[PDB]
Design a protein around this nucleic acid. Structure first.
Ligand SMILES: [Mg+2]
Ligand SMILES: [Mg+2]
Ligand SMILES: [Mg+2]
Ligand SMILES: [Mg+2]
Ligand SMILES: [Mg+2]
Ligand SMILES: [Mg+2]
Ligand SMILES: [Mg+2]
Ligand SMILES: [Mg+2]
Ligand SMILES: [Mg+2]
Ligand SMILES: [Mg+2]
Ligand SMILES: [Mg+2]
Ligand SMILES: [Mg+2]
Ligand SMILES: [Mg+2]
Ligand SMILES: [Mg+2]
Ligand SMILES: [Mg+2]
Ligand SMILES: [Mg+2]
Ligand SMILES: [Mg+2]
Ligand SMILES: [Mg+2]
Ligand SMILES: [Mg+2]
Ligand SMILES: [Mg+2]
Ligand SMILES: [Mg+2]
Ligand SMILES: [Mg+2]
Ligand SMILES: [Mg+2]
Ligand SMILES: [Mg+2]
Ligand SMILES: [Mg+2]
Ligand SMILES: [Mg+2]
Ligand SMILES: [Mg+2]
Ligand SMILES: [Mg+2]
Ligand SMILES: [Mg+2]
Ligand SMILES: [Mg+2]
Ligand SMILES: [Mg+2]
Ligand SMILES: [Mg+2]
Ligand SMILES: [Mg+2]
Ligand SMILES: [Mg+2]
Ligand SMILES: [Mg+2]
Ligand SMILES: [Mg+2]
Ligand SMILES: [Mg+2]
Ligand SMILES: [Mg+2]
Ligand SMILES: [Mg+2]
Lengths: 55, 95, 48, 118, 47
RNA sequence: CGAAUGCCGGCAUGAGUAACGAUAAAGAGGGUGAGAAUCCCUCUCGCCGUAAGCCCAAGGGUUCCUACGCAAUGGUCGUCAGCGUAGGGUUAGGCGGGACCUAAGGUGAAGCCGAAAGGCGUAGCCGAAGGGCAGCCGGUUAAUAUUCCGGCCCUUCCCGCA
């Protein structure tokens, strides 16, 4: 913000922000009586969007 | 033809290789089919030395991968040779 | 034996389950000497 | 219930939870300040205060007593000769527990400080 | 508990081996098929 | 194409739930590192001890040693690893097996039988954790050692001499 878009740090707030869901990596979890489920270790796309306070 | 220069591939370069220079003992990479007897003459003929004892051992190459491409490096044999006492190989004396 | 759910539970009903799941922010007090922030009745990361 | 039952088991049986307090004490009477979890800390407290108080009594008996737990002649000497003396005009409260503001990770556990007083 | 694969390198070369297959017409036809399908390994690999 | 407990794929629910795999047990100080309950060192505690220690044979196949790494693999974490990359490392006349023997059985000149493919079979040949055959003790490397080195012994073949 400061360093690129010349935003003046002292008045920064968090305008909007959110995490969408990335592609999930699947792995095999061996189970009783030969069974083997699959568990998914997932992925987040985190987004913080900053804007300037008006004071 | 098979000449001596075929039996002898290259010198082995390692701490452990070097560490034997100081006794009579010089170790090369040799062709994998080459027997203790003929390795001797091949080294006599090439470096004009007397050979007294031969030690061979095979070095089976490492499996390596380029990423879905999986194969192995080629297989070797090495000899560590004993020159007659006092003889040297000045060829091999650059450390 | 081996009880099972009878119906996929709805997007409405699982989200309402979660109405309590929301976090609450850490409890924080201004520090005695340094400028910074601290949890109360603890030893300040700066100037303990 | 628990109901006026007092004193902690912390996920240890009798044997191991004894050996715990003994070991904690050995380490406090060595380093003079220590860092553990908030509850392990709060239970140490009295376990040393008595160990200390007995060094303040000074006699051959009170020594032989303290050796049951601390087990080590040298550490005991430090206790009787060089530690208890700072306390002789002090009535109780030879230790202090302050909690640290950060907690472990992969653990989450809150930690505290245990130091001998002054 | 004792299970079905008890690897032994002699048994393997003696049973599924190349000279094995070649001794019996049943087994020459094993090799013929495998060769025709274009198998990479015509015969079990024992070390 | 809406249904076939259809087929292939993808994404949900149960749910932040059950579990995280022997109840032998941990605590602290210090180091390293962007980051440490989980790595390294010290101290204390606990558990194996006809083993949960050490050798050998299978089987496995570089997993060994060391440097640089942490995306994934590791039921957490990881700065660690049996993991990624790379380099190095396995040395024998006497140890094991072969240029020795035969065993079951296999195979097989001779021979015998069977539409064909094949089945049999003497002698021979093959076949071993059996018979036979000469190396003990130390030291050395990050990593091999009855293999290299030190000391003290031995076998067979070839040639010569008595
Ligand atoms: Mg399971
Ligand atoms: Mg199974
Ligand atoms: Mg599912
Ligand atoms: Mg040619
Ligand atoms: Mg050899
Ligand atoms: Mg009860
Ligand atoms: Mg618990
Ligand atoms: Mg007990
Ligand atoms: Mg049995
Ligand atoms: Mg199976
Ligand atoms: Mg075998
Ligand atoms: Mg091919
Ligand atoms: Mg229809
Ligand atoms: Mg429920
Ligand atoms: Mg529950
Ligand atoms: Mg649970
Ligand atoms: Mg457990
Ligand atoms: Mg540091
Ligand atoms: Mg640092
Ligand atoms: Mg015993
Ligand atoms: Mg093996
Ligand atoms: Mg395997
Ligand atoms: Mg590998
Ligand atoms: Mg290792
Ligand atoms: Mg390292
Ligand atoms: Mg990783
Ligand atoms: Mg992980
Ligand atoms: Mg590695
Ligand atoms: Mg033979
Ligand atoms: Mg010969
Ligand atoms: Mg024979
Ligand atoms: Mg036959
Ligand atoms: Mg027969
Ligand atoms: Mg034998
Ligand atoms: Mg034998
Ligand atoms: Mg022998
Ligand atoms: Mg070793
Ligand atoms: Mg020895
Ligand atoms: Mg020797």
């Amino acid at each position: 913000a400061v360093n690129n878009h010349d935003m003046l740090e002292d008045r920064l707030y968090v305008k909007a922000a959110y995490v969408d869901e990335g592609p999930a990596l699947k792995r095999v979890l061996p189970r009783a009586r030969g069974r083997a489920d699959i568990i998914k270790k997932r992925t987040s796309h985190i987004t913080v969007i900053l804007g300037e306070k008006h004071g | 033809m098979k000449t001596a220069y075929d039996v002898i591939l290259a010198p082995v370069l390692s701490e452990k290789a070097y560490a034997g220079f100081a006794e009579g003992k010089y170790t090369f990479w040799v062709h994998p089919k080459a027997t203790k007897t003929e390795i001797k003459n091949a080294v006599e003929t090439a470096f004009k030395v007397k050979v007294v004892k031969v030690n061979t051992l095979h070095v089976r190459g490492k499996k390596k991968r380029l990423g879905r491409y999986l194969g192995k490096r080629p297989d070797r044999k090495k000899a560590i040779v004993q020159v007659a006492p006092g003889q040297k190989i000045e060829a091999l004396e650059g450390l | 034996k081996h009880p099972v759910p009878k119906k996929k539970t709805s997007k409405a009903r699982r989200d309402a389950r979660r109405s309590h799941h929301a976090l609450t922010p850490p409890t924080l007090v201004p520090c005695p000497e340094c400028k910074a922030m601290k949890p109360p009745h603890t030893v300040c990361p700066e100037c303990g | 219930m628990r109901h006026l039952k007092s004193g902690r088991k912390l996920n240890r049986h009798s044997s191991h939870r004894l050996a715990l307090y003994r070991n904690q004490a050995k380490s406090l009477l060595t380093h003079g300040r220590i860092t553990t979890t908030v509850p392990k800390a709060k239970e140490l407290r009295g376990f040393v205060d008595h160990l200390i108080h007995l060094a303040k009594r000074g006699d051959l008996h009170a020594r032989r007593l303290v050796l049951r737990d601390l087990q080590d002649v040298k550490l005991v000497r430090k206790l009787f000769d060089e530690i208890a003396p700072r306390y002789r005009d002090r009535q109780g409260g030879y230790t202090r527990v302050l909690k640290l503001a950060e907690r472990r990770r992969g653990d989450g556990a809150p930690l505290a400080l245990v130091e001998l007083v002054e | 508990m004792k299970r079905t694969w008890q690897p032994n390198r002699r048994k393997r070369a003696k049973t599924h081996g190349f000279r094995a297959r070649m001794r019996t017409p049943g087994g020459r036809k094993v090799l013929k098929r495998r060769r025709q399908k274009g198998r990479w390994r015509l015969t079990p690999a024992v070390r």
